[PDB]
Design an enzyme around this catalytic site. Sequence first.
Site, mmCIF file in Angstrom:
data_model
loop_
_atom_site.group_PDB
_atom_site.id
_atom_site.type_symbol
_atom_site.label_atom_id
_atom_site.label_comp_id
_atom_site.label_asym_id
_atom_site.label_seq_id
_atom_site.Cartn_x
_atom_site.Cartn_y
_atom_site.Cartn_z
ATOM 1 N N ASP A 53 0.828 -1.198 0.000
ATOM 2 C CA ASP A 53 0.000 0.000 0.000
ATOM 3 C C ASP A 53 0.871 1.260 0.000
ATOM 4 O OD1 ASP A 53 -2.030 -1.901 2.128
ATOM 5 O OD2 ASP A 53 -2.533 -1.386 0.039
ATOM 6 N N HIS A 63 12.589 12.163 -10.084
ATOM 7 C CA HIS A 63 12.510 10.756 -9.684
ATOM 8 C C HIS A 63 11.225 10.089 -10.132
ATOM 9 C CE1 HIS A 63 11.077 13.078 -6.158
ATOM 10 N NE2 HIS A 63 10.189 12.106 -6.045
ATOM 11 N N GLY A 71 17.588 19.290 -3.961
ATOM 12 C CA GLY A 71 18.897 19.300 -3.316
ATOM 13 C C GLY A 71 18.784 19.458 -1.816
ATOM 14 N N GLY A 73 18.294 20.677 1.802
ATOM 15 C CA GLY A 73 17.446 21.701 2.402
ATOM 16 C C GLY A 73 16.142 21.823 1.644
ATOM 17 N N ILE A 75 12.646 21.235 0.438
ATOM 18 C CA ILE A 75 11.745 20.072 0.521
ATOM 19 C C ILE A 75 12.532 18.869 1.027
ATOM 20 C CG2 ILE A 75 10.318 18.428 -0.797
ATOM 21 C CD1 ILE A 75 9.823 20.646 -2.809
ATOM 22 N N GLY A 85 -1.890 2.518 -6.965
ATOM 23 C CA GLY A 85 -0.625 2.902 -7.595
ATOM 24 C C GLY A 85 0.288 3.644 -6.634
ATOM 25 N N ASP A 93 13.843 12.868 0.294
ATOM 26 C CA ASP A 93 14.908 13.486 -0.506
ATOM 27 C C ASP A 93 16.271 12.945 -0.057
ATOM 28 O OD1 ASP A 93 15.616 16.942 -1.586
ATOM 29 O OD2 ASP A 93 16.578 15.027 -2.089
ATOM 30 N N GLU A 94 16.907 12.157 -0.914
ATOM 31 C CA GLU A 94 18.244 11.635 -0.605
ATOM 32 C C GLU A 94 19.322 12.736 -0.462
ATOM 33 O OE1 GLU A 94 19.070 8.065 0.075
ATOM 34 O OE2 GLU A 94 20.324 9.526 1.144
ATOM 35 N N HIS A 113 5.265 12.516 9.908
ATOM 36 C CA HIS A 113 4.532 13.528 9.152
ATOM 37 C C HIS A 113 4.133 12.977 7.786
ATOM 38 C CE1 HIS A 113 4.006 17.868 7.672
ATOM 39 N NE2 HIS A 113 4.200 17.219 6.536
ATOM 40 N N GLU A 114 5.088 12.365 7.072
ATOM 41 C CA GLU A 114 4.821 11.779 5.751
ATOM 42 C C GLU A 114 3.770 10.698 5.792
ATOM 43 O OE1 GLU A 114 6.721 14.662 4.389
ATOM 44 O OE2 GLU A 114 5.688 13.271 3.051
ATOM 45 N N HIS A 117 0.338 11.985 5.839
ATOM 46 C CA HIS A 117 -0.134 12.211 4.477
ATOM 47 C C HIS A 117 -0.549 10.903 3.819
ATOM 48 C CE1 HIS A 117 0.898 16.391 4.392
ATOM 49 N NE2 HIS A 117 2.203 16.218 4.314
ATOM 50 N N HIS A 123 -2.031 19.402 6.012
ATOM 51 C CA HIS A 123 -1.203 20.158 6.942
ATOM 52 C C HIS A 123 -2.016 20.878 8.009
ATOM 53 C CE1 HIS A 123 2.230 20.247 3.806
ATOM 54 N NE2 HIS A 123 2.449 19.304 4.701
HETATM 55 C C1 LIG Z 1 7.960 16.886 10.319
HETATM 56 O O1 LIG Z 1 7.800 16.515 8.950
HETATM 57 C C2 LIG Z 1 8.079 17.313 7.864
HETATM 58 C C3 LIG Z 1 8.146 16.702 6.610
HETATM 59 C C4 LIG Z 1 8.432 17.455 5.477
HETATM 60 C C5 LIG Z 1 8.658 18.831 5.584
HETATM 61 S S1 LIG Z 1 9.024 19.672 4.267
HETATM 62 O O2 LIG Z 1 9.598 18.772 3.288
HETATM 63 O O3 LIG Z 1 9.961 20.697 4.652
HETATM 64 N N1 LIG Z 1 7.734 20.301 3.674
HETATM 65 C C6 LIG Z 1 7.186 21.493 4.311
HETATM 66 C C7 LIG Z 1 6.577 22.427 3.266
HETATM 67 O O4 LIG Z 1 7.609 22.946 2.419
HETATM 68 C C8 LIG Z 1 7.008 19.666 2.566
HETATM 69 C C9 LIG Z 1 5.958 18.735 3.143
HETATM 70 O O5 LIG Z 1 5.121 19.157 3.930
HETATM 71 N N2 LIG Z 1 6.027 17.447 2.777
HETATM 72 O O6 LIG Z 1 5.124 16.527 3.297
HETATM 73 C C10 LIG Z 1 8.615 19.451 6.845
HETATM 74 C C11 LIG Z 1 8.310 18.690 7.977
HETATM 75 CA CA LIG Z 2 15.652 18.955 -0.384
HETATM 76 CA CA LIG Z 3 21.544 11.476 1.915
HETATM 77 CA CA LIG Z 4 1.032 2.824 -3.177
HETATM 78 ZN ZN LIG Z 5 8.304 11.883 -5.251
HETATM 79 ZN ZN LIG Z 6 3.769 17.659 4.568
#
Ligand SMILES: COc1ccc(S(=O)(=O)N(CCO)CC(=O)NO)cc1
Ligand SMILES: [Ca+2]
Ligand SMILES: [Ca+2]
Ligand SMILES: [Ca+2]
Ligand SMILES: [Zn+2]
Ligand SMILES: [Zn+2]
Length: 158
Positions: A53, A63, A71, A73, A75, A85, A93-94, A113-114, A117, A123
Amino acid sequence: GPVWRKHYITYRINNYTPDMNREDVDYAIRKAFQVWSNVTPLKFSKINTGMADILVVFARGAHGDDHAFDGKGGILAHAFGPGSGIGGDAHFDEDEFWTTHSGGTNLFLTAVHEIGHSLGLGHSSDPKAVMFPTYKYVDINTFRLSADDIRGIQSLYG
Ligand SMILES: COc1ccc(S(=O)(=O)N(CCO)CC(=O)NO)cc1
Ligand SMILES: [Ca+2]
Ligand SMILES: [Ca+2]
Ligand SMILES: [Ca+2]
Ligand SMILES: [Zn+2]
Ligand SMILES: [Zn+2]
């Protein structure tokens, strides 16, 4: 907004960041799922092959979805709401440096947090909520969902 319409949810770790020990990536992701199963009827299980899932991916730049990473910082990660899907999938982000601690970006807190979602949450405007869309490290040993997170997820499940 969409929710999962079943109680047993699967996840799979597509690939592993070289920033961390493998067992630490497993444990961070497991603990993050557990944060949400603590407050809903949901059950999460890691599978090793086949369609999950929620697919957990580490990737940099472009990607394959239409949402390129930027890069180091900015996102840190993004995820898709429940659905078929790519639905549910969480991408990290690697180009960040993932850790088990306060150094770099903490994988566990970000994953909480992810996965929010991945489960259908949006949010929050409350700085105290894990769903507040700004990363601020907090001690992960004693992390707690805010009342806002709990209300949000309980309005979707249970
Ligand atoms: C605590 O978890 C997180 C996870 C990602 C981010 S974050 O990647 O900085 N961000 C904030 C908005 O630019 C994007 C987002 O909400 N992705 O789900 C900030 C905090
Ligand atoms: Ca980034
Ligand atoms: Ca890394
Ligand atoms: Ca899936
Ligand atoms: Zn993606
Ligand atoms: Zn988020």
